[PDB]
PDB file of C-alpha atoms in Angstrom:
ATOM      1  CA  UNK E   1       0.000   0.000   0.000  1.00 54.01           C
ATOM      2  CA  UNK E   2       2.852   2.341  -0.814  1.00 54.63           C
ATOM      3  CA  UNK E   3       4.448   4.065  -3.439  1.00 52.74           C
ATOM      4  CA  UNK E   4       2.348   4.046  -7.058  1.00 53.73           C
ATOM      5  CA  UNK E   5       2.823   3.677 -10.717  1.00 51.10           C
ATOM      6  CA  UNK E   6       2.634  -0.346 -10.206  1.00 49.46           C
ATOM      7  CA  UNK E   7      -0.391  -1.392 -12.801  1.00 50.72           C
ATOM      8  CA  UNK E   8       1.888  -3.269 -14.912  1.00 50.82           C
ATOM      9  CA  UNK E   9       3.859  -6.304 -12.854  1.00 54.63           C
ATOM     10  CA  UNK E  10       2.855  -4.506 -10.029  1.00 54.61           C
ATOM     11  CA  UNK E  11      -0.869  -5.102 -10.346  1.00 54.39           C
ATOM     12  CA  UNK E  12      -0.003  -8.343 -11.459  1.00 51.54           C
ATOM     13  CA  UNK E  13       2.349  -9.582  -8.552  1.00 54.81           C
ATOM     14  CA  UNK E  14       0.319  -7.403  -5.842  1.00 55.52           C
ATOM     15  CA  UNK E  15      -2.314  -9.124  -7.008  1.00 56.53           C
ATOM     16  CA  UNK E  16      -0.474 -12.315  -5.601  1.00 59.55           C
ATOM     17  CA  UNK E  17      -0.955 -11.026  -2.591  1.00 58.47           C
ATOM     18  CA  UNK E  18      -4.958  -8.952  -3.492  1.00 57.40           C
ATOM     19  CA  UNK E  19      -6.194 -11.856  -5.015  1.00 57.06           C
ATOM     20  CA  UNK E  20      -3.879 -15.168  -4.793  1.00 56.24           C
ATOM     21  CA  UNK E  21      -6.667 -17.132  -6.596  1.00 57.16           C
ATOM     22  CA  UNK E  22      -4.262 -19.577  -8.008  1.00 59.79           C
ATOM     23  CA  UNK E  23      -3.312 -17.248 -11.070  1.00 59.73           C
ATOM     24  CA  UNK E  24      -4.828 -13.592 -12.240  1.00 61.48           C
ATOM     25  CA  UNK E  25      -5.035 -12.161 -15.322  1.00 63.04           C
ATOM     26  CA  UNK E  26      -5.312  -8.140 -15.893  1.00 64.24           C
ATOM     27  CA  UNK E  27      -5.003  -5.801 -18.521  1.00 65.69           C
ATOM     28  CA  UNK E  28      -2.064  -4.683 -19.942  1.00 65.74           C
ATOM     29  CA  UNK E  29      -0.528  -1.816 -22.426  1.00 63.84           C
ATOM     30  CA  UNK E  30       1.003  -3.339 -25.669  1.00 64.28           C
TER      31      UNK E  30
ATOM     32  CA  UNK T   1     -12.024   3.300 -15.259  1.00 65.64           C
ATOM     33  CA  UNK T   2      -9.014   2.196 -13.884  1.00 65.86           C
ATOM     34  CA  UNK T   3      -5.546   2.431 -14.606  1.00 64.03           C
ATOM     35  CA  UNK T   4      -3.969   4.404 -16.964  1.00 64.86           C
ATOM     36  CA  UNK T   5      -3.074   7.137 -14.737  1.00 61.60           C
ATOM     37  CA  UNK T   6      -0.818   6.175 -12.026  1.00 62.59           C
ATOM     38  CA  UNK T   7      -0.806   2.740 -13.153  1.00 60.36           C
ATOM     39  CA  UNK T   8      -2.874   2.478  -9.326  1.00 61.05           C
ATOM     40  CA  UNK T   9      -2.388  -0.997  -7.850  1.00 61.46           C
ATOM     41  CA  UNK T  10      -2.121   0.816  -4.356  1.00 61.64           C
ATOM     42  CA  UNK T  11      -5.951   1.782  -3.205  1.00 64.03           C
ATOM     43  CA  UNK T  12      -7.618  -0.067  -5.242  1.00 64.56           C
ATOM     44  CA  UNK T  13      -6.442  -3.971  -5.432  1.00 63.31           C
ATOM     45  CA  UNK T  14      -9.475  -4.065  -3.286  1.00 63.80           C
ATOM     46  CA  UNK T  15     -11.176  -4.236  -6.628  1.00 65.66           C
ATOM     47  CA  UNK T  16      -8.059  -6.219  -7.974  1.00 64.17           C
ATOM     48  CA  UNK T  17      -9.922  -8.754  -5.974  1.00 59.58           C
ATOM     49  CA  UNK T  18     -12.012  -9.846  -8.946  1.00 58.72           C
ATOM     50  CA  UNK T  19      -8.781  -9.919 -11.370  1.00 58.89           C
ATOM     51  CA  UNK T  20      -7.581 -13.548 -10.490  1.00 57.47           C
ATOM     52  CA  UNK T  21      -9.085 -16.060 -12.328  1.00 55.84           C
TER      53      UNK T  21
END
């Protein structure tokens, strides 16, 4: 919960630790 | 939306709740 700009493998590997569903899958730029 | 901006992913995983599969 600190620091910003993460969206990219930040969303992604936070989200290891948001969602930890075994796997995620967001959106990402090019 | 979401994203785009400051690429986030601080207050608002809460909603990257519904991102894993």
């Amino acid at each position: 919960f600190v620091n910003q700009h993460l969206c990219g493998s930040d969303l992604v590997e936070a989200l290891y630790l948001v969602c930890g569903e075994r796997g995620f899958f967001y959106t990402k730029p090019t | 939306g979401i994203v785009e901006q400051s690429c986030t992913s601080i207050s608002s995983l809460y909603q990257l709740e519904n991102y894993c599969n």
